[PDB]
Symmetry: C2
Subunit: 181 residues, 2 copies
C-alpha cells in the first residue's frame, strides 16, 4: 500500500483507542510546535466526521515552569479560551521572546487578555485541570515517545511524518490511519 | 558549501564551547538511542585528536525512574564501568524488556555485573554523581532541545542529521562542525 508500517508510521506498544482520535503532543516552549500550528489547524478541519482532535501539553521543557505551563494549557481547555490563548502563548514566548519567569507572570498573561482573575484562579488550581495534566503526562510516558511535536492516531499509531510529500499527502496518511484499528 | 545552516545543522541559542566537544543527549529508555549506539561507537574512534565525546542522560523518560536512571548513568562514569554497563543497561530494558521497577532493582543490575555494593552506594549517592546529573539536565534545558537522541557539536551546533547520506557523510558533517566556532 501507499502507507507501510515501519516507513510512514510506527505501531506503539499501547492499546488502540476504542474511538477515532488524533492526538498531538507538544509544548509551548517547543519552536517547531509553533511552526506546526497552521498545519494542525488545517488537519482538524480536514478530519472526517466523528473523529476528535486532542492536544496534550508535555511538562519536560521549560525547567521548573514546565509543569505550570501544562496546567496553563489545561486551564485554556477548562475556560474554553483555547482559540485566543494558544496563539497568545506561543507568541509571548517565541516572537516576543519574553518567557513567564514564574506562576504570577504566567497568570498575568491571561489577565492581560481579559480572562477574569477569579475564573482563572478557580480553574488553574482546580481538580479538572489537575486531572488533565496528569493525563497529559501519563499518556506521554505510556506511549514511550522521545520528543515533540508528536502526532499519534488512535492511541497506537505514531505518525512518522518525516516522509510525507505535501500537506495533502500528510492529511491522506492521518485520514488513512484513523480507519485502521 | 556541502553543509548549509538551516539544512544540515541548526545553530542553538547558546555560547559556543571554548574547546571542541561532541555531546550526545539520550536516555536508556529511548529505543532509537539504543539503535544509535553502533554509530556512536564509530564516530568516537573517527573523531579528530583533541576533541572530547560527552554523553548526557536526560531524565524525562521512564516516569519516576527517569532521574534515578540518570544517576545510574552518572554512576557509570564515576566508577569507570561505562564500557560494560551501558550495553547491559540498554539490553535489560529493550531486549530483555525487563525495566527496573525501582531503585533497589536498578542497584541490583549493577550488583549482578560484579560491581561492588559499597562502591556503587558511595558513588550513586555521592556529590560527583549529583553534580553530574544536574549538569545533564541544565544542558538539556539551556539548549532548548525537544527530544533524544540529539548530537550537539561545540555546544551550539545541533546536528540535524536527518539529511546525511551514509555514515561516512555523517562523520564528515560532525568533523566539519567541530572546526566551526
Amino acid at each position: 500500500a501507499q502507507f507501510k508500517e515501519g516507513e510512514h508510521y510506527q505501531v506503539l506498544k499501547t492499546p488502540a483507542s476504542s474511538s477515532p482520535v488524533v492526538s498531538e503532543f507538544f509544548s509551548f516552549y517547543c519552536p517547531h510546535c509553533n511552526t506546526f500550528e497552521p498545519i494542525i489547524a488545517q488537519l482538524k478541519q480536514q478530519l472526517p466526521e466523528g473523529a476528535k482532535f486532542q492536544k496534550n501539553h508535555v511538562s519536560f521543557m521549560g525547567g521548573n515552569m514546565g509543569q505550570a505551563m501544562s496546567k496553563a494549557y489545561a486551564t485554556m481547555i477548562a475556560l474554553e479560551v483555547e482559540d485566543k490563548m494558544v496563539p497568545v502563548m506561543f507568541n509571548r514566548i517565541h516572537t516576543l521572546r519574553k518567557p513567564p519567569k514564574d506562576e504570577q507572570e504566567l497568570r498575568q498573561i491571561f489577565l492581560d487578555e481579559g480572562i477574569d482573575a477569579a475564573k482563572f484562579d478557580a480553574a488553574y488550581n482546580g481538580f479538572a485541570v489537575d486531572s488533565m495534566v496528569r493525563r497529559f503526562d501519563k499518556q506521554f510516558q505510556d506511549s514511550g515517545l522521545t520528543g515533540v511535536p508528536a502526532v499519534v492516531v488512535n492511541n497506537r499509531y505514531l505518525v512518522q511524518g518525516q516522509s510525507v510529500k505535501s500537506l495533502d499527502e500528510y492529511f491522506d496518511l492521518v485520514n488513512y490511519l484513523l480507519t485502521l484499528k
